[PDB]
Design a binder for this molecule. Structure first.
Ligand SMILES: CCCOP(=O)(O)OC[C@H]1O[C@@H](n2cnc3c(N)ncnc32)[C@H](O)[C@@H]1O
Length: 622
């Protein structure tokens, strides 16, 4: 009984109403077909992933070799001779079948201020922005920084970069000017797409003013594409800044999509790591797109006429994979939500679902716990078409699971706790919608092409059998796996492939129970997740140490109901001219200037245990 977190927890089947209220049948017949297809995906993956790639993707030129490389050397290449384009698979091929089919369902910050975009309209707007970038010097292989909020213009900026072969480096709207500047210089981006101002939950985000303050140290940026979101008077540097609505009307509504290799870099997504500077994880085209289409088809049970809603932001891989690519690849409607879960009221999430007849909802448990405390007077909507409920970022608690199952799902929808990371590109351990039975707090079985292993951290040896515990690792590579860390492959190898040779190291502790289910126990390294943002404790410590009156700094993350994790900072202060309260206030703002407002610590305590600072003694006292 080594796995104590699985003691007495029971299996939860798919509700009988799921099958009764289903428009069609699910993609897999039963649980055995999963096992049959899963064992095929790990025994002979070369034949498996080849059949899947041609069913879900349409290539310019066919491929011959499914996979070469290994995890030992970090030289993985998938579908090496194939050629394709991301914009074609997301827009063009669906617009060819029927251009009047809905692609994007835009729900603006204020209710009843959105719009509905068809695949034909999406192809035109993507083609126009593609032309604007081409006429601004964007060539194949260049990087473009996307500093946009959750407006439909963000999805257009994604595929416009992919249509011409550019590499889009999306920066979460709300990072400080210093964070944006660093992500621009590291990727060498010469073009940046942004808005004049942002509108989230009634508050205004001065995006354009942040970009201006960031570009003061980014000289190589020569083009800024600004979209008029609020129309407020914003600083304008002429010759460099250009208005979206002005430049868009100059160029044709169609452009030919650049043929890309399977292993051409598709995008960069900068992810905070265990140490040093935030590193830009890279994903190629064919493998990543196949990962998104596969998980959408089998985890979320996405069909043609479905309406998909993911609460994640585009600044995160959740919005990358499941707001943009996975739904559009499969040809359904994706909901682009610009507001907060509690604006103007706590029923907003469900207001959108009922209005747009959403079939699949994807939320973080941190947002569920906040709405659960508010009261059940807000969730009185029928939400008749809600079929798959998804959680991400943390294991869903048994009490939160029941609320998600009864109030939202009406005891008729399948809850899927999906475990994955930015470097996985898509779900790796998750239940299959309408197939896999679940356990509250467990991520259920692994996905196709995911061979998980429990590793003894001290011994570095794999622990076989069930009812085992250790750290989580993958034995063989999968198509969606990240290919490198931009500008630092050595850092990529040491972080993910040199910890346990022949394995991919997730950086999480895990356990496997008697039934074979997996239980994610959280990060092993110095990494925390606050409000959906992945932060490094070492990075926050460096910002605090920069203060002239901070001798040393120590930051540790503990559990928190409001934001998943809470960053608590221990600081040592020399004598100074201003009091501790002023320094305490000045220490929080200093972190906001380096990283952002969300990186602000919950509390700072002027105090230092050492032998090497013991993080455990600092956490346990809290
Ligand atoms: C994909 C969400 C955002 O991705 P990021 O790369 O920012 O963070 C991934 C990490 O979030 C946790 N995590 C994510 N999903 C779960 C999950 N379902 N259960 C437990 N922990 C989870 C795991 O520690 C993981 O290494």
């Amino acid at each position: 009984a080594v796995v104590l977190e699985a003691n007495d927890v029971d299996t939860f089947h798919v509700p009988k109403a799921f099958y009764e209220k289903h428009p069609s049948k699910t993609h897999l017949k039963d649980l055995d077909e999963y096992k049959k297809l899963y064992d095929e995906s790990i025994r002979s993956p070369d034949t498996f992933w080849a059949r899947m790639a041609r069913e879900l993707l349409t290539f310019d030129k066919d491929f011959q070799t499914t996979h070469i490389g290994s995890l030992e050397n970090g030289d993985n290449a998938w579908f090496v001779e194939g050629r394709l384009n991301a914009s074609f698979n997301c827009v063009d091929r669906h617009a060819i079948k029927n251009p009047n089919k809905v692609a994007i369902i835009y729900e603006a910050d204020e209710p009843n201020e959105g719009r509905i975009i068809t695949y034909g309209e999406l192809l035109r707007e993507v083609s126009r922005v593609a032309w604007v970038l081409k006429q601004r010097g964007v060539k194949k292989g260049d990087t473009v920084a996307i500093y946009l909020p959750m407006i439909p213009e963000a999805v257009v900026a994604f595929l416009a970069c992919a249509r011409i072969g550019a590499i889009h480096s999306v920066v979460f709207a709300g990072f400080s000017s210093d964070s944006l500047r660093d992500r621009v210089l590291d990727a060498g981006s010469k073009v940046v797409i942004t808005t004049d101002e942002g509108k989230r939950g009634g508050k205004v985000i001065g995006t354009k003013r942040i970009v201006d303050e960031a570009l003061k140290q980014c000289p190589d940026v020569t083009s800024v594409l600004v979209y008029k979101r609020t129309g407020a008077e914003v600083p304008w540097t002429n010759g460099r800044d250009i208005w979206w609505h002005e430049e868009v009307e100059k160029y044709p509504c169609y452009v030919a999509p650049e043929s890309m290799s399977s292993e051409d870099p598709l995008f960069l997504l900068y992810t905070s790591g265990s140490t040093g500077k935030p590193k830009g994880v890279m994903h190629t085209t064919a493998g990543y797109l196949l990962g998104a289409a596969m998980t959408g088809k089998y985890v979320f049970d996405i069909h043609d006429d479905d309406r998909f809603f993911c609460g994640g932001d585009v600044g995160w891989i959740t919005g990358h994979t499941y707001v943009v690519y996975a739904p559009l690849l499969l040809g359904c409607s994706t909901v682009v939500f610009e507001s907060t879960p509690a604006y103007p009221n706590f029923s907003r999430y469900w207001d959108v679902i009922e209005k747009h007849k959403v079939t699949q909802f994807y939320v973080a448990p941190t947002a569920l716990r906040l709405l659960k405390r508010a009261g059940d007077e807000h969730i009185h909507h029928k939400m008749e078409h809600l079929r798959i409920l998804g959680s991400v970022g943390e294991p869903i608690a048994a009490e939160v699971w029941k609320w998600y199952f009864e109030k939202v799902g009406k005891e008729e929808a399948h809850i899927c706790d999906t475990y994955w990371q930015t470097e996985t590109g898509s779900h790796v351990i998750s239940p299959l919608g309408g197939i896999t039975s679940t356990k509250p707090g467990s991520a259920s079985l692994p996905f196709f092409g995911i061979e998980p292993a429990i590793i003894d951290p001290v011994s570095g040896e794999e622990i076989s059998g069930n009812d085992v515990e250790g750290v989580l690792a993958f034995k063989q590579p999968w198509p969606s796996m990240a290919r490198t860390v931009w500008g630092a492959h050595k850092r990529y190898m040491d972080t993910y492939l040199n910890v346990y040779k022949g394995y991919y190291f997730t950086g999480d502790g895990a356990g496997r129970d008697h039934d074979g289910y997996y239980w994610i126990r959280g990060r092993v390294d110095d990494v925390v997740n606050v409000s959906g943002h992945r932060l490094s404790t070492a990075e926050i410590e460096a910002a605090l140490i920069e203060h002239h009156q901070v001798a040393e700094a120590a930051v540790v993350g503990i559990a928190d109901e409001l934001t998943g994790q809470a960053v608590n900072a221990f600081v040592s202060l020399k004598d100074g001219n201003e009091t501790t309260e002023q320094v305490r206030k000045d220490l929080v703002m200093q972190v906001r200037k380096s990283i952002g407002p969300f990186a602000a610590p919950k509390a700072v305590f002027v105090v230092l245990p050492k032998t090497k600072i013991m993080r455990r003694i600092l956490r346990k006292i809290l």
